[PDB]
Amino acid sequence: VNSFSGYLKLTDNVYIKNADIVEEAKKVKPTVVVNAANVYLKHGGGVAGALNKATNNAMQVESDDYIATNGPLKVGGSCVLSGHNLAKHCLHVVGPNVNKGEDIQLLKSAYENFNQHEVLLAPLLSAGIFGADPIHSLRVCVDTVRTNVYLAVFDKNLYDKLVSSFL
């Protein structure tokens, strides 16, 4: 039993809710919140910009030190950093950005990072300003993640389309 509330159950391990991941994280304080990151951990917009703003830019400060030490992430890769005031840990995961011409096949690799954590609060990788089809992203999530994932979908219209079109 966990403290996630109001989710629809899609499969044995995947749950979904129309919610702002920032407000969700601030309520649940999960062990892991997933950020929709880029390789430079520059959290300017989308989910990343929102999560960082909620940390008063502490996420960006930590991230800049991480990059200065380690260099950029790989597309499809991840790193574990602090969750600041939102969660214990933030798993920064880089899904392919279609608007950069990146290979959508790497979305499966991105979701594989979730399997290293027993429970996660997460957005739909490569959706939003990353340009991928969210219905496809949800499909890959369900077919790749085996640990317990709670998906927060910001847009109510999109949330209704993902449920009603889910196979």
Ligand X SMILES: CN(CC1(O)CCOCC1)c1ncnc2[nH]ccc12
Interacting residues toward Cl ion by CB under 5 A: 36, 46-47, 128-129
Nearer to Cl ion, 15 or 130 (CB): 130
- The answer to whether residue 21 forms part of the interface with ligand X (CB under 6 A) is yes
User: Using CA atoms, how far apart are residues 54 and 27, in angstroms rounded to an integer?
Assistant: 13
Size of site (CB under 6 A) for ligand X: 16
- The answer to whether residue 86 forms part of the interface with ligand X (CB under 6 A) is no
| Partner interacting with residue 155 (select from ligand X, Cl ion, none; CB below 5-8 Å by kind) | ligand X
- The answer to whether residue 127 forms part of the interface with ligand X (CB under 6 A) is yes
Supply 154's token pair. 């910001």
Q: Select the span of 1-9, 18-26, 93-101, 106-114 touching ligand X (CB under 6 A).
A: 18-26
The CB-nearest residue to Cl ion is: 46
| Partner interacting with residue 153 (select from Cl ion, ligand X, none; CB below 5-8 Å by kind) | ligand X
Residues of this chain that interact with ligand X (CB under 6 A) are 20-22, 46-47, 50, 123-124, 127-128, 134, 152-155, 158
